[PDB]
Homo-oligomer: A and B are copies of this chain.
Amino acid sequence: SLDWQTLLNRERLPFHKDHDRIIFSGAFRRLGRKTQVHPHTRLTHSLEVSCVGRSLGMRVGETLRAALPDWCDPSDLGMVVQSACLAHDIGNPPFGHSGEDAIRNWFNQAAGRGWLDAMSETERNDFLNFEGNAQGFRVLTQLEYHQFDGGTRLTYATLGTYLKYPWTARKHKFGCYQSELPILEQIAGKLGLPQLEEQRWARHPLVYLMEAADDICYALIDLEDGLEMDLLDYAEVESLLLGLVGRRKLAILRGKAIEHLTNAAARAFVEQQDALLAGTLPGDLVEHMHGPAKRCVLNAKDMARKKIFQDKRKTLHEIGAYTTLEILLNAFCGAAVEQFGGRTPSFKHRRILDLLGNSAPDPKAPLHASFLRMIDFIAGMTDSYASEMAREM
């Protein structure tokens, strides 16, 4: 039974400090050199989503002030959501979503070769379903700052708000590696989140605001740079926006479109605290948005896919990305396998292992533990650094 007083637990593994720790982290900074594969970086996207996220949190924070702990002003609710929004894409690897797919699929292959036999079937699932949410969770709680001792040591509320997939790999979506399970359990516990299935907990309500803030921004801003990429026509974009509201003339429309969409998202979160604060709500917040808002998002996205996502230049770049990644995976994971169980790696792999020196995985460590170390490294790379190293390799 979700309680607004437990769901906003300020204890850590206040909200303003969560924000700063994320902004100063090397993982966040690297987003400035990480982009989605195009035919506007992951960092500028994260910043925009955090504005809309904060705004969403503040609106609902005002609307439901009496239901929230007396210590929590709306500006505090906005901060928790803003922070989660900044951390949201911190785990994706070079080449973004495409790189995510490239890694997941590279694993289904390496597996069909036994590279993963030394692993149980469950641990193996962690890689076969590689999702950036799981990697981001590990980065936030294990890799940054206090390594393997709380990590970024954020508030339980920010973490709960970050976890859109609070469950194990057991659509390919999950946000917790077999190695973070104890952490997810403790967090869920502190937030008083029901454990529906065994290794699956219920979502923290605020995750819905973060998600909504994310699709609101992809929806509108993808159109904007889809325009500066000459892949979209002004009239169509202007029409889609005017559709809900009633190049700088567009930024002004964009501004109004964002207001309405934020209002619509906020006035859907408030309308559904019953099915929200208890049990589960049917899918995502956008579906429960009123007609013209719910459609502006759908249509905007559909447009991006057709004219941007489907472009063949993008396709060809995604192939290059895939190849750059496999070259990397083959090398590091190959080295992980070569030294597993105390085996003496052959020359060439020793040097690949030296590249990490202090970050290298211990030879006597189980395969899952060491592969995680390889993925930590690769997933943390900036796009250019990845291509660079694949090349000079």
Which residues of A does B touch, CB under 8 Å?
16, 19-21, 23-24, 29, 32, 40-41, 43-44, 47-48, 51, 54-55, 58, 73, 75, 101-102, 105, 108-109, 144-147, 230, 248, 251-252, 254-255, 312, 315-320, 322-323, 346-348, 351-352, 354-355, 357, 389, 392-393
- Tell me how many chains of this kind the complex includes: 3
In the A-B complex, list the 9 residue pairs whose CB atoms are closest, starting with the nearest.
A105-B347, A20-B51, A75-B75, A320-B392, A315-B354, A29-B44, A315-B351, A32-B32, A322-B348
A328 to chain B, nearest CB (A): 12
Contact check, A54 vs B16: say whether CB atoms are below 8 A apart. yes
Residues of B within 8 A of A320 (CB): 392-393
Residues of B within 8 A of A101 (CB): 347
Of B41, B105, B255, B352, the residue contacting A346 (CB under 8 A) is: B105
Contact check, B351 vs A318: say whether CB atoms are below 8 A apart. yes
CA distance A274 to B392 in the complex (A): 52
Residues of B within 8 A of A316 (CB): 355, 389, 392-393
Interface of A: prevailing SS = helix
CA distance A348 to B323 in the complex (A): 9
Apart from A19-B51, A312-B354, 4 more pairs, CB < 8 Å = A32-B43, A102-B348, A318-B351, A319-B393
- With contact pairs A23-B47, A105-B348 given, residues A16 and B58 touching in the complex (Cβ less than 8 Å): yes
Q: Identify the closest chain B residue to A78 (Cβ).
A: B16
- With contact pairs A41-B32, A355-B312 given, residues A145 and B348 touching in the complex (Cβ less than 8 Å): no
Residues of B within 8 A of A47 (CB): 23, 47
A48 to chain B, nearest CB (A): 6
23 A-B residue contacts at CB 8 Å? A16-B55, A20-B51, A23-B47, A29-B44, A32-B41, A32-B43, A73-B75, A101-B347, A102-B347, A105-B348, A108-B346, A144-B248, A145-B248, A146-B248, A146-B252, A147-B248, A312-B354, A312-B355, A315-B355, A319-B348, A319-B393, A322-B348, A323-B393
